Amino acid sequence: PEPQMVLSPLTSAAIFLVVTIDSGGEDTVRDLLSDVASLERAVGFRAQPDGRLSCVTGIGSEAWDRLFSGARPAGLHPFRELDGPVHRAVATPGDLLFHIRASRLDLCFALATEIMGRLRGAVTPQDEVHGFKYFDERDMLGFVDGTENPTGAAARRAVLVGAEDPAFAGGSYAVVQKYLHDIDAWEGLSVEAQERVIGRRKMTDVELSDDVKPADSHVALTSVTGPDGSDLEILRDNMPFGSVGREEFGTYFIGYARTPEVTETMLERMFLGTASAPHDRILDFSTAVTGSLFFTPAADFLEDL
Amino acid sequence: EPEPQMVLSPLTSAAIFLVVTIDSGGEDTVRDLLSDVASLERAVGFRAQPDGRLSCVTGIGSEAWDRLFSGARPAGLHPFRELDGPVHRAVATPGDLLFHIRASRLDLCFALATEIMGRLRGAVTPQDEVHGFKYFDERDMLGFVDGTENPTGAAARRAVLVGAEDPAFAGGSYAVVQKYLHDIDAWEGLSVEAQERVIGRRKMTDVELSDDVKPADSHVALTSVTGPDGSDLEILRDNMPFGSVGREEFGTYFIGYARTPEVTETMLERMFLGTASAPHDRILDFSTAVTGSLFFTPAADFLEDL
Amino acid sequence: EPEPQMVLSPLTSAAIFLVVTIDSGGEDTVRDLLSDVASLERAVGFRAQPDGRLSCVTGIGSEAWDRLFSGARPAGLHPFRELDGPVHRAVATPGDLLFHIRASRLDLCFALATEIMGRLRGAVTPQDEVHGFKYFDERDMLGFVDGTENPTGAAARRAVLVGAEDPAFAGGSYAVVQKYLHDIDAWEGLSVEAQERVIGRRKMTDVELSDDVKPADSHVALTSVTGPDGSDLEILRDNMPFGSVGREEFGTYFIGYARTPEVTETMLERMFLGTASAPHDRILDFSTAVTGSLFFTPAADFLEDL
Amino acid sequence: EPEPQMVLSPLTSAAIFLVVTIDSGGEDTVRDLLSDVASLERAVGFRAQPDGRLSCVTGIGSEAWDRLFSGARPAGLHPFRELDGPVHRAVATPGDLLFHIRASRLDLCFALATEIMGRLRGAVTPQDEVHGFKYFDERDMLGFVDGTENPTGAAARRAVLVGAEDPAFAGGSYAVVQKYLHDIDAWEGLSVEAQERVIGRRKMTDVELSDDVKPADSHVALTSVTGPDGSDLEILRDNMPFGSVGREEFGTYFIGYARTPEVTETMLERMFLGTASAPHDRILDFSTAVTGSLFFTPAADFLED
Amino acid sequence: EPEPQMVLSPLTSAAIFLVVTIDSGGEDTVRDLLSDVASLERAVGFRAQPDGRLSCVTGIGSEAWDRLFSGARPAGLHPFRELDGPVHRAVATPGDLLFHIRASRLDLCFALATEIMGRLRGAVTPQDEVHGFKYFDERDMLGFVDGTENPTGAAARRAVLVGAEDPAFAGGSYAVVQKYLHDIDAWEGLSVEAQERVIGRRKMTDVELSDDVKPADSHVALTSVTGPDGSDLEILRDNMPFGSVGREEFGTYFIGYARTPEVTETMLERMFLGTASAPHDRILDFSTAVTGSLFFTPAADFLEDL
Amino acid sequence: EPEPQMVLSPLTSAAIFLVVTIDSGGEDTVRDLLSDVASLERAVGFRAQPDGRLSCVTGIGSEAWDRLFSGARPAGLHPFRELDGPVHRAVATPGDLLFHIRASRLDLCFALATEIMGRLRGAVTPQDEVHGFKYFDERDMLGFVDGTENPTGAAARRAVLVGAEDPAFAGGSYAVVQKYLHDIDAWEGLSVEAQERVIGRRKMTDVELSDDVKPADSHVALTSVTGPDGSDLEILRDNMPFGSVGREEFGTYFIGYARTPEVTETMLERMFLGTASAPHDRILDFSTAVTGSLFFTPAADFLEDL
Ligand code: HEM
Ligand code: HEM
Ligand code: HEM
Ligand code: HEM
Ligand SMILES: [Mg+2]
Ligand SMILES: [Mg+2]
Ligand SMILES: [O]
Ligand SMILES: [O]
């Protein structure tokens, strides 16, 4: 079973499109899903091999039940809201996700145009973010973002559904959150204080050692080991976005994993805290304004419709 | 002696256009920023040399000029003139400062825009912010190659930079901006041959239609002007696509630089008001202007001294 | 595995196709060159890593096979079969050896071709030499993107490489070549919408025309065949433009690789002989085949051991 | 005043040389094409920026100049003069127009050549068409780096562009072309040391042989000329390999630009006819000229009218 | 797989080779660093993706192995064995740890080397540090292309990586290093043809000399070994030039990886000790080895768990 | 101009600095080499155009100028002056000739350096040889962006090239070199905020600290000097990191070019001797100068003519 392009090369541009399916829109949607791979080739092939255009399509829980019948992915549910003492992770509507990536924005925009052209009148846009790599893989807080992502076989094993849910092997679960940062507040910290929030050094991206890294740093709370001692990992492809006029500086978070349990555990630790940590310090400078969960099927599941 | 801003830029694949108004009381903050904007361009850009190709051209409008400076005004500076054609209208919208930021990548544009606006918050109000990108092989949203007949090298220097005619402001230029939104559904209902008739060139190969066959209300026909002496009058354009798929906005951000606005304004009159043989530029049947402003972009040394 | 030749190449922008026949007495010289051709590919190409992307696929025809080797023949190897259609003909021309040389620049191709022909001088007679070049947006001589639907990765391995069905020759492939000359004047008299109807895809955007609108005598319609499996039958193509402006020759060099010739031969029957609903492939109204040959491209290890 | 044609071009790895004669009656068609060839160059080349580096230099021969124009002639314009040397001969062959088309890739060259010949069909007859390719380390067909001592910047402007000495035609240049075919088997039978003695420079490192060991009949010896005041007389060359393996043609297409043909012609006389010290240029013992033509390449403004 | 280190790297144009010994008492510090060396490679290299191509391969010597680790030893690990030939000698020099750091640019190599040595200061003593750079056409200091016949893809995986013959260490490899200094004055007194006879390949075109002309004491002749197997025994080399023009040092840093040291050691014996028809490798008449060590480069996973 | 040497070079990422003394008897060898150094630069560089960007700038010291040439001296040419400050000292070390070799890759640098020193064998004695590499965002060894405020374009020509003040030597420049070694352990114990106060710019963003917070003893404060008119006096710098990890050498090789050495010497006096308001440049608390020389780099025409 061929997976979608969840494991992509590093790409410098992305469009994230989240839509809801209008009443009556189900058939239009199904026809599009069966064509999305061929549109990806048509737009992408003439810019090979530099273009690295790919589109990962995801389907939400309530939408899955309107479109298909029979067996469902084992872990597919609506994003679970987290009501922490201080910080909250909201859930927002989203039936379909298009995660469109390439080495240039225009390829992204051309593919998005074709997809929404086929869907006009069946869907309603909920979110559209045009993302860009910032410098040397930095995010909007000025830290390198991506460094501890798994690679190669460790990545395939962390992100692709296997034997545990055989009918959906080759699929993945994507969680999306749009975050806005309070840059004024962040920039009032010293660099050393910022490093204590993230858990790594700013200029060199070296992890802080275990004897200085705080329990409420981001890296501390998103490190999770499983009952057998192995690391529980996700694949992230966070993108900066913003608008200077509106003072909007953002990180669009997207995390892929073989089951939503992994991602959800990390989220609980960040928002709700642990025995030793009230919450992830990064949330004192970052507000989530969207939250959705999607299942990204194997490519063959979409071809056969 | 005088160093121009980077009006004549290499081809760049990302741009930010920022148009603001100066609030009451903001003038001093703005003047400090103008004198530092070249420094900020170096601070952001130098670490990404030589690939980055970051430049910022700063432009000042007619009313803002009188609030900011006294003494001489550049000879051609006035407010953008609204054009009320029989069918199509070129609006004038508010604009005191233009920052036309270009680079080979968006992040550098954004980083410089962030630094500029960081110094100016409290003193200005944003009116328009567009993030532009190059689309394929220099194509615009209508699917045609865009820029082909721009002047280059010495001809560009001569068409764009103020010289002896206004010696206090030699090295400056005049910029006209209009944000255009396209009706892509209408446009895509035309055959390719019909689209070529609107533009005046071939779509795939970008070869100009012969005199034999080019309509008089084609875009290329209307924007070709020879001056009293018989030589052509040229501008320098760096149009950028922009858009949002969910809102159905597909746009062209027009910016044209010229040594005097009279050239740009004549082209605009022809397009909106027509000629004896052409009611209006057919491109306007698929393109609506929603902003319009005119700025003077001084020589770099003018700004350095404040 | 055994190591296949570089049938599955990265995208390359230049090629040389060489077709020769083996003269009387030439077999020994040929067999020496075959055993060294991989090391000549590395000699010429290694110093130009990693941009060079130079490869050479060597193929052997049916008659030549029996002069060169004894023991088993590959299952599918036979002379190219002439197709005498009502209107269009697929001709057969002589060819014992194919060198399909690809790289990112012509000079590398030429350098390797020079070395190969150097070793063969006086053993072979050239029948065809074509210097091909890809247009800058993967377009062909007709102006359409060419390559889009080729299979990739595991699907390509499955469609192209001989496997368990003929185990002594696993890792090999079958190559069909035809040189096509186009009538560019005729083709350029069609509208874009008409040309799209001949091909089956949009010219500018390369999106496939939908099933409800794509004519049955369009190229894409006729070269889509499903097997008994239900699954599509695929080939791997690497068509290359060529020509000469002084002689008015504008051409497409077709080369198609498949795990058995039955796939390629079916497509050719459909194009040249037609189906229940289509007289012939409309592309042949603008394209004439003037060569036709079929080769087996053995696994690299087969050649190394001689 | 005058914008020259793109005589001083960036390094380009591909070229098409097209030489045609103007048929009886063809003069008007030619004139119309000349006035448009700059705009064809932009049409084909602009969309391939900035990599494409497409340019076309157009040149006109002496007899054709008389058919096309009246009024002033360029001072230096005359038909190529045959050299009948004791051993080697430089032939003169017909040609009224030259298109010297250059780019980073052959297809751009071909696209522009196609447009040009399309407009000239029926008015001209092709005499020569060569598709050139530079080897990857600026080597020529003989394996030597080719172009090392070309002038650059202001030295090149001084050497190639007509100035105040012929002010009606300032910004123009004179092009000489010769197609050479090589005897590769003879050449490859020389040791490297013997080859270096023919050329005048070291083969692998491209360092010039010192004055005390460079032969008098080496190529570099004979093509170094000083003028009355003792300064070097210089040309700009853009020699391209070409060939066909099937027909055993291995060639160098010579093109030299100079502000007057006297410089190029003197170098040619030294090569073909000899000096007191040297019977002839040793490179001609491996190279035969099979065309020879001379053209004036006007300032681009001259063609715009 | 277990995950190997990046033994099979893309082509890289810079390297640092660092050889250190472990001071007594330093073993715990070293074990900590080995468990973090992969994360340091990512911290330094991630921000420079994808062009940076920084990798670090870490190798452990025989005696160090015994001081550092509990369990079983790799089967092939021993001290480098001195070779005392009639004319030329391969010396064995001290080395407990090898860091073979490669990238597209020296700065990344240096930055990683700095971080590694930062953690080791006080626990190790530097024995050798070489900053290598590739000549622009993959040439070495003798002017010959270097790397041409290395194995590729699956053939490389098979020649370099320990498999089920030593299953606890599958995914490891064995590295041999020797620093060579050349007598450039002597070498440059040879004609090109005589140099070609020492190496066994053509200097300009890198084509192998034919079997009837290639000397038996040529480098290529001596380092071509067939196994008991019938077939070729291969190693993977990544030789780097280095030097200092003031000191007249012009060098080649030899590094060879193999799945067992037997292969590399055979080649070395042939070079230094000779064969029936060759006294020794002629290259050694212009090259003096001044270091020599052997290391085991474990699988990535082995190091992660310490 | 007469044609200057390549003092104004593009950004390059590698360099070799070679400083030598002329031995007795060496004068004529040196003179021959000077007249050929441009042609060596082309021989090594041409075949790697235009990616290579190889240049060599050749400079001559005061004492050596008198040995080599008769006739006029450059007005500004004198031995580097030692500065014996209360705390820090700028040493003067011997040097007759400087070769400042720059390119995009080290191997081109090394190849040209090899040719130059090969011609000078036996006539000169090497005093200093440094191989420099740029860190990947134009950062130096202290982690700051280095080069931001260098002049460009006509401002650079005006700052660095001799003109009509010394018309015989128009086109020349004056280069000062100093090799510095850094105390990295001390530097890394400062907070980033404290480092910024040493340099005078922000570390991450490279923005200049504002006049109200920048300390008087910061590097930027002390190296800003205004001339009689109130304009900035500028130099052109191309500082290069270098180092050796095993020897714990981390260095900055300083090279500054100016039209007269008075400008560079003023800056050095301020840094090392201090002013009324600054004891000395705080960068010297982390940087020790171990060489110091001054050279005149003539116009290229001057070297051709002999
Ligand atoms: C709010 C915006 C976010 C920002 C700006 C951000 C930023 C960062 C940065 C700079 C790192 C260190 C470098 C790296 O390894 O990539 C990192 C690591 C990580 N983040 Fe986040 N992050 C955000 C949200 C999240 C969320 C919501 C999750 C999980 C649900 C998450 C999971 C991770 C994980 C798993 C790691 C790697 C930890 C390890 O070293 O083992 N991040 N993030
Ligand atoms: C006469 C010159 C030829 C030209 C100029 C040409 C051009 C094209 C073009 C433009 C496409 C559509 C884009 C793509 O998927 O590549 C295409 C598709 C194809 N062509 Fe051709 N073609 C030629 C001859 C042939 C021949 C002789 C064959 C088979 C023997 C063939 C087999 C195919 C196949 C199999 C496809 C893709 C079908 C699918 O869409 O699933 N072509 N060709
Ligand atoms: C001074 C040291 C060395 C230099 C300058 C050098 C240079 C070269 C050159 C120029 C080639 C031919 C091109 C190629 O295939 O890469 C080559 C091949 C080779 N060298 Fe070396 N080499 C050196 C040391 C060694 C050593 C010490 C070994 C073995 C322990 C070795 C093993 C080989 C092998 C296996 C080949 C490939 C032979 C084949 O199958 O063609 N080299 N070397
Ligand atoms: C250890 C030696 C050095 C280091 C690591 C160093 C580093 C730097 C850095 C980081 C900057 C700020 C960015 C820039 O504009 O380049 C700078 C500026 C500067 N440095 Fe240095 N520097 C060194 C030595 C010197 C010396 C010895 C001089 C003068 C003789 C000098 C002259 C300058 C000048 C003129 C500026 C720019 C001032 C203006 O900002 O308008 N540097 N240096
Ligand atoms: Mg705020
Ligand atoms: Mg002190
Ligand atoms: O993250
Ligand atoms: O500096």
UniProtKB/TrEMBL annotation, chain D:
Binding of Mg(2+) 2 occurs at D183, D185, E248
Report domain Dyp-type peroxidase N-terminal positions.
5-134
Give every Dyp-type peroxidase C-terminal domain span: 137-301
Cofactors needed by this protein, per the record, are:
heme b
InterPro entries with a match to the protein in the record: Dimeric_a/b-barrel, Dyp_perox_C, Dyp_perox_N, Dyp_peroxidase
Instruction: Provide GO CC annotations from the record.
Output: cytosol
Q: Which domain of life is it from?
A: Bacteria
Annotated binding of Mg(2+) 1, by residue? D183, D185
Its keywords, alphabetically, are:
Heme, Iron, Metal-binding, Oxidoreductase, Peroxidase
In the record, the note on similarity to other proteins reads: Belongs to the DyP-type peroxidase family.
**Protein name (database record):** Dye-decolorizing peroxidase (DyP), encapsulated subgroup
What is the species listed in this Swiss-Prot or TrEMBL entry?
Answer: Streptomyces lividans 1326
